[PDB]
């Protein structure tokens, strides 16, 4: 019967809860409470690029520390040589509707999307000297949000249709899907030793996906609106979500449960992207309120403040090797902080 | 030595520039319609030339670039309005089935209400007004519609109706106007039509900019 | 990719020629082009340096102001016009491919040349030996000097080493002191320090015989080495 269903998920409910609540015997805020503050970090501009015509919706570092890739609505792609500020390649596009980006692990391919609903990946290695697209992957129904790379040979997308995908580009068609949300996803996350991954998806709920499997291990849930960005510690045990009622919040994987909420009485904006540090004490958040704030990871109190934007913060990257921290905003300008 | 290499970045740049004095000349159009709107007569018509298409031509040495999105609108979260950088927006309306009119109707409040765009222009086309030539001395208006005050014969008491039952859901009066139009199958004059809009709109714009305001 | 040459032959002391490279199969717009020299038995030496946008014109010392170098991009040729030729000018003439960005890999194809005949700060290069015989299934180790150090502040070491079979021409074996080009089999290396370099090849094959030849480019003028010659 519907109705015994209904009542057996119910029923399901109530035991998780109560597993849940069983288990928070202390609280990080108590157990910290014997830490040396960290101290005023203030950070200044090292270099400025500038190039681009419009918007700037996107922004990846390469395994190098050295180049990174950025994407504008003006329908363009640079890739950018940081320590002596140069321009190695300038990729156009077929689509102006540009809003994800991202670098191979190994440094040959790289891979754009938008509101085509068609994911592009574009080879750089090449004999003849150009740039000439390699491989065009389509077969969502919706836009695309955000993709990520695996190797040189697997690819996983996140798209606005509710759902989320691992494509093989050899071949070129599905090999996994993804489903069970309900609204539209955001962005996602990989796993330090790519076996799992994390998406959020405007439900305020985010999602524990396996790729062997090809199942959903845990569901967590707390906002109250949309959920815009994600990133793992550097651990691979714990993750940090932010929404869109100026609030952060962090997670870990293995008690099932909400360790700490960081925000302030004069935070009334939204939250644009969200990046960790190497060793997992400082974490870095975008604002609509034309800055970025720097949050202590353990004490949930304020470090310090980037202030040099005069619109909104989109891109918030940092290094492999832990020495500077990339910035993007909608004033058509990238800039490096140490 | 490899120097040489910040000279390729030199003439990068410059392709950039020339790109530059291009983009800002370029005026943006997003339309919207239905699907008995007359859409596909009105883009084959005008000798123009599967997700967001685009179209792109020129009228008196001015580019024009229309963006046609296809009944993916129904998408209602903030951002897939990432369009706050067109200057007009262009419904189709069909006056012939009164049935659908509400539905077409309620469409309107949805999007001319939101809060990206509260500096752009709305155009509206009124659509084959020969239908109605039929209708109106045939079927009245009142079995759909209660509040005409007028006499459900003659057509402009009824075109008249008609537009303000559509100027009537539009708050914050005046930022930019609204305009409208009657249209079956002119195909020639409205690229004129839809050039006079734009220019009363730059007008409006630039009295801003000079403070005589 | 495909680069041929034209418009060698004989003449007479005095007079005047021109040659002309065409380009197949990649971007010509987007690349540099060098003409190289070689005497009858002897060793290479540089003739003139062209560079994309037309903007960067280098000569040497024995041609400066009596040769000139052009490009014509839509049809795709390169140009070089000879002035009051000479007796020691008689040699064999090759075309050279060239990038430079970060990450990339100068000198990676060469032409098939033309054949004329005629009826210091420099940076110095030596040449260990002239002859080495050798085994075939041995290991082999070969080794030239310079007169600078080569490490410049920015952590790069600019040395190469190539490679020329009997009857071809010549194809790059090693850049900037430890990488490989693509195409060769991974069996050879390099290594070395400021003011010494050495290059090792391990389990020596047939077609692994030539002259090879080591190469600076730290600042023009670049200068070439003797060669030596594996007899197998």
């Known amino acids: 019967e519907l109705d015994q269903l209904r009542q057996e998920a119910e029923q399901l409910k109530n035991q998780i809860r109560d597993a849940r609540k069983a288990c928070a015997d202390a609280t990080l805020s108590q157990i910290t409470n014997n830490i040396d503050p960290v101290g005023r970090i203030q950070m200044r501009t090292r270099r400025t690029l500038r190039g681009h015509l419009a918007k700037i919706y996107a922004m990846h570092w390469g395994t190098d520390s050295r180049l990174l890739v950025s994407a504008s609505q003006d329908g363009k792609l640079i890739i950018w040589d940081s320590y002596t500020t140069n321009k190695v390649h300038a990729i156009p596009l077929r689509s102006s509707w540009v809003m994800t980006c991202a670098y191979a692990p190994s440094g040959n391919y790289v891979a754009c999307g938008g509101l085509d609903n068609i994911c592009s990946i574009y080879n750089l290695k090449t004999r003849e000297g150009n740039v000439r697209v390699s491989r065009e992957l389509a077969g969502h129904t919706g836009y695309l949000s955000c993709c990520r790379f695996l190797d040189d040979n697997q690819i996983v997308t996140s798209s606005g249709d509710t759902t989320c995908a691992l494509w093989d580009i050899e071949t070129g068609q599905q090999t996994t899907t993804f489903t069970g949300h309900t609204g539209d996803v955001m962005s996602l996350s990989l796993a330090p030793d790519t076996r799992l991954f994390v998406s959020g998806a405007c439900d305020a709920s985010a999602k524990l996906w396996d790729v062997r499997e090809g199942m959903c291990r845990q569901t967590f849930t707390g906002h109250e609106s949309d959920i815009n960005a994600i990133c793992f510690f550097p651990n691979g045990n714990a993750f940090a979500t932010g929404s869109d009622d100026a609030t952060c919040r962090l997670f870990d994987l293995r008690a099932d449960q909400e360790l700490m909420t960081y925000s302030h009485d004069n935070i009334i904006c939204g939250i644009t992207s969200v990046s960790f540090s190497k060793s997992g004490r400082l974490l870095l958040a975008g604002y609509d309120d034309f800055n970025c704030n720097v949050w202590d990871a353990l004490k949930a109190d304020r470090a310090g403040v980037l202030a040099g934007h005069d619109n909104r913060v989109s891109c918030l990257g940092v290094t492999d090797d832990g020495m500077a921290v990339a910035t993007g905003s909608w004033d058509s300008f990238l800039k490096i902080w140490n | 030595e490899d120097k040489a290499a910040a000279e390729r970045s030199k003439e990068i740049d410059k392709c950039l520039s020339r790109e530059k004095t291009y983009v800002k000349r370029l005026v943006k159009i997003l339309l919207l319609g239905a699907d008995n709107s007359g859409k596909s007569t009105f883009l084959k018509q005008m000798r123009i030339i599967k997700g967001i298409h685009e179209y792109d031509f020129e009228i008196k040495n001015v580019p024009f670039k229309m963006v046609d999105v296809g009944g993916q609108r129904s998408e209602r979260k903030r951002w897939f309005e990432c369009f706050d950088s067109v200057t007009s927006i262009l419904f189709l309306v069909d006056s012939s089935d009164f049935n659908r009119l509400t539905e077409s109707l309620n469409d309107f409040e949805t999007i001319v209400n939101n809060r990206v765009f509260s500096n752009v222009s709305i155009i509206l086309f009124l659509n084959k007004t020969d239908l109605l030539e039929e209708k109106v001395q045939i079927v009245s208006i009142k079995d759909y519609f209660l509040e005409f005050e007028g006499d459900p014969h003659c057509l402009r008491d009824v075109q008249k109706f008609l537009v303000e039952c559509f100027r009537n859901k539009r708050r914050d009066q005046q930022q930019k106007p609204l305009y409208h139009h009657f249209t079956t199958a002119i195909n020639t004059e409205n690229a004129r039509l839809i050039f006079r809009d734009v220019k009363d709109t730059i007008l409006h714009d630039n009295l801003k900019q000079l403070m005589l305001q | 990719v495909q680069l041929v040459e034209s418009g060698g032959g004989l003449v007479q002391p005095g007079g005047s020629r021109k040659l002309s490279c065409s380009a197949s199969?990649?971007?010509?717009?987007?690349?540099?082009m060098h003409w190289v020299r070689q005497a009858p038995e002897k060793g290479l030496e540089w003739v003139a340096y062209?560079?994309?946008?037309?903007?960067?014109?280098y000569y040497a010392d024995t041609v400066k102001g009596r040769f000139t170098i052009s490009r014509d991009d839509p049809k795709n040729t390169l140009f070089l016009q000879m002035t009051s030729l000479r007796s020691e000018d008689t040699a064999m003439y090759y075309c050279?491919?060239?990038?430079?960005?970060?990450?990339?890999?100068?000198?990676?194809?060469w032409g098939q040349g033309t054949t004329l005949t005629v009826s210091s700060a420099d940076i110095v290069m030596t040449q260990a030996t002239s002859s080495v015989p050798v085994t075939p299934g041995e290991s082999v180790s070969i080794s030239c000097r310079s007169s600078?150090?080569?490490?410049?502040?920015?952590?790069?070491?600019?040395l190469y080493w190539f490679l020329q079979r009997p009857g071809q021409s010549p194809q790059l074996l090693i850049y900037?002191?430890?990488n490989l080009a693509s195409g060769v089999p991974d069996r050879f290396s390099g290594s070395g320090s400021g003011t010494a370099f050495t290059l090792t090849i391990s389990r020596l094959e047939a077609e692994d015989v030539g002259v090879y030849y080591c190469?600076?480019?730290?600042?023009?003028?670049?200068?070439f080495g003797a060669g030596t010659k594996l007899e197998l």
């Open positions: 050279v491919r060239s990038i430079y960005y970060y990450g990339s890999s100068p000198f990676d194809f």
């Open positions: 199969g990649f971007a010509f717009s987007s690349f540099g």
């Open positions: 062209i560079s994309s946008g037309s903007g960067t014109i």
């Open positions: 600078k150090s080569l490490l410049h502040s920015n952590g790069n070491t600019y």
């Open positions: 900037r002191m430890s």
């Open positions: 190469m600076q480019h730290l600042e023009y003028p670049l200068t």
